[PDB]
Amino acid sequence: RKRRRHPS
Amino acid sequence: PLESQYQVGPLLGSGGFGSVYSGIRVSDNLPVAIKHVEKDRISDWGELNGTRVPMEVVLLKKVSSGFSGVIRLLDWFERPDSFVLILERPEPVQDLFDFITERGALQEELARSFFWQVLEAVRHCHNCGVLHRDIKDENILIDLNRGELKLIDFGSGALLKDTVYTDFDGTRVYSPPEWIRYHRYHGRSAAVWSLGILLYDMVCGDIPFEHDEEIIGGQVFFRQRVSSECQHLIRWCLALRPSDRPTFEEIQNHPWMQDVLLPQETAEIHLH
Ligand SMILES: C/C=C(\C#N)c1ccc(C(=O)O)cc1
Numbered sequence: 001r002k003r004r005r006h007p008s
Numbered sequence: 009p010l011e012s013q014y015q016v017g018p019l020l021g022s023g024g025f026g027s028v029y030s031g032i033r034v035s036d037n038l039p040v041a042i043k044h045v046e047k048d049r050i051s052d053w054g055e056l057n058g059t060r061v062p063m064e065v066v067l068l069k070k071v072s073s074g075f076s077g078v079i080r081l082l083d084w085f086e087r088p089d090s091f092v093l094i095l096e097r098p099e100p101v102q103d104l105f106d107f108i109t110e111r112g113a114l115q116e117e118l119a120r121s122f123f124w125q126v127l128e129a130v131r132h133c134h135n136c137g138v139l140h141r142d143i144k145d146e147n148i149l150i151d152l153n154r155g156e157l158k159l160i161d162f163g164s165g166a167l168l169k170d171t172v173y174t175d176f177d178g179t180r181v182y183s184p185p186e187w188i189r190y191h192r193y194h195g196r197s198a199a200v201w202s203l204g205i206l207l208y209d210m211v212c213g214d215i216p217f218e219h220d221e222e223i224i225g226g227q228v229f230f231r232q233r234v235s236s237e238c239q240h241l242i243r244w245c246l247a248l249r250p251s252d253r254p255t256f257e258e259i260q261n262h263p264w265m266q267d268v269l270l271p272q273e274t275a276e277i278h279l280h
Contacts, residue, residue, distance in 0.1 A: 003109060003214045005024075006179050008142055008164050 010085050010092055016042060025161070030097070033082075039097040040082065045163070046090050051177060052166065062091055067138045067162045077129030079149070079160045095160075100152045103160075104145035104210075113213035113232045116264075121274040122150075123207050124265060125157040130199060131256055133159070139168040139195040142178035143202040145209055155275030168195055181205070181215055185224040185248055197250035200259070204245025211238055216246075224248070237264040 010016075017030035020041060027044040045062055054066035061084070068081035080096040104122070108114065114122070126148065133140055140147075142164040149158040164178040172192050176183060184201035187193045208216045212232045217223045226248045230239060241264045247253045259265065269277065 001214065005105060005146055006144075006181050008161075008177060008179050 010042075010094075013083075014040060014042065014094070026163075031094070033094075038082075039099050041095040041097040043093040043095060044090050045093065048089070050091075054167075061086075062163075063167075064163045064165065065091065065093065067165045067167070068093070070136045070138050071133055071162075073132075073136075075129075075132050076156050077125060077132055077159060079158050098149060098151040098154075098156075098158060101149050102152060104148040104150055104157070107150055108145055108209065108213060114210045115278070116211060116235060116238055117269065118274065118278045119207065119210040119238075120265060121155070121269040121271070121278075122148075122157055122210060123203075124260070124268040125271065126159070126203065126206065127256060127260055129157065129159045130203070134168055134196070134199075134256075137168050138162070139166045139199065141165050141176065141195075141198070142182070143199060143206060144179050144182050145206060146179075150279070151275075152279050153275060155271035155273070155279055166195070170194070173198070178202075181217055181223070183223070184250065185226075186250055188220050188223050194250060196255070197253050200245050200253045200256070201250075203259070204242050204253075207238075207245065208242050211242075235264065237262075240264070 014031045014033055020028045020030050029042045031040040031042040033040050050062045052063035053060055054063040065084050071078045072081045081093060082096055083094040085092040140159060140162060142161060147159065147161045149160055172194060174192055176187055182202040182205045184193055184198045205215050211234050212230065216228055228243050228246055241262045244254050
C-alpha cells in the first residue's frame with residue numbers, strides 16, 4: 001500500500 | 009550578523025523541511041538548524057516591543073524553555089525579504105514519518121512512549137498559549153540516542169484561544185470532520201482529533217483516512233493487530249462530534265497509557 005507525506 | 013555567528017552548512021533534507029540548513033554556532037559548536045522563511049509567503053503576523061515578526065517566531069518564543077519536547081528557538085534575524093530562525097538541532101535524528109516508513113507498525117510499548125511524549129509536548133504548548141495545528145509524524149523529530157521526541161514546524165500554528173477558529177493551513181488528512189464540513193473548529197478538540205490520527209499511524213503503520221469522505225464517515229478499520237484498549241483510545245480521539253472526544257487528562261488517564269517507558273528506556277530497548 002502507498003504511504004506518502006501530505007503537504008500542509 | 010548571522011554569517012559571523014554561525015558556520016552555515018548544506019541544505020537539510022533537500023528542502024523537505026523547507027529552506028532549512030545545517031549549521032553550527034561558532035560560540036560553542038552547538039549544532040543548529042537554520043530555517044529561512046520568505047516574508048511574501050507569511051500568512052499570519054505577530055508582534056514581539058513593536059517588532060512585527062512572523063507568528064511562527066511569536067509561537068516558538070512562547071514555547072522556548074528547558075522543556076525538551078518542543079524545538080527550541082535560539083535566535084532569529086530579520087532580512088529585507090525574509091526571516092531567519094536559529095533552532096537547536098538534536099543529533100542523531102530521524103523524523104517519525106521516516107521512522108514509521110522504515111519500521112512499519114510500531115510495537116504498542118513504543119507507540120505508548122512516543123504518544124505520551126507528544127501529549128506532554130502539546131500540553132506544554134497549550135500551557136504556553138500556543139496551538140500547533142499541524143501535529144503529524146512529519147513534524148516530530150526523534151532524538152535517537154536520548155529517546156526524546158521534538159515537536160517541530162510551528163508555521164501553521166496560532167495563539168491558543170477558547171473561541172472558534174475559521175482558518176486552517178495544517179495537514180488536511182489530520183484535520184477534523186468539523187473543519188471538513190463546516191470550516192469551523194475549536195483548538196483543543198481539533199488537536200485531540202489529530203492525535204487520534206497520529207496514534208493510529210503509529211500502531212498501524214499509516215494514517216487511517218486519505219479522503220474527505222473517510223474523515224467524516226466515522227468508521228475506523230484496523231489493518232494491524234491492535235489491542236482493544238488502544239483501539240478504544242483511538243476511536244475516542246476520533247469521535248465525530250468534538251464534545252465526545254477526550255480531554256488531554258482523559259487521554260493520559262486512559263488504561264492504554266499506563267506504565268509508560270522513560271525516554272532513556274525507550275532508546276535502549278527500541279532505538280539503540
Ligand atoms: C533536521 C531538522 C530539523 C532540526 N533540527 C528541523 C527542526 C525544526 C524545523 C521547523 O521548526 O520547521 C525544521 C527542521
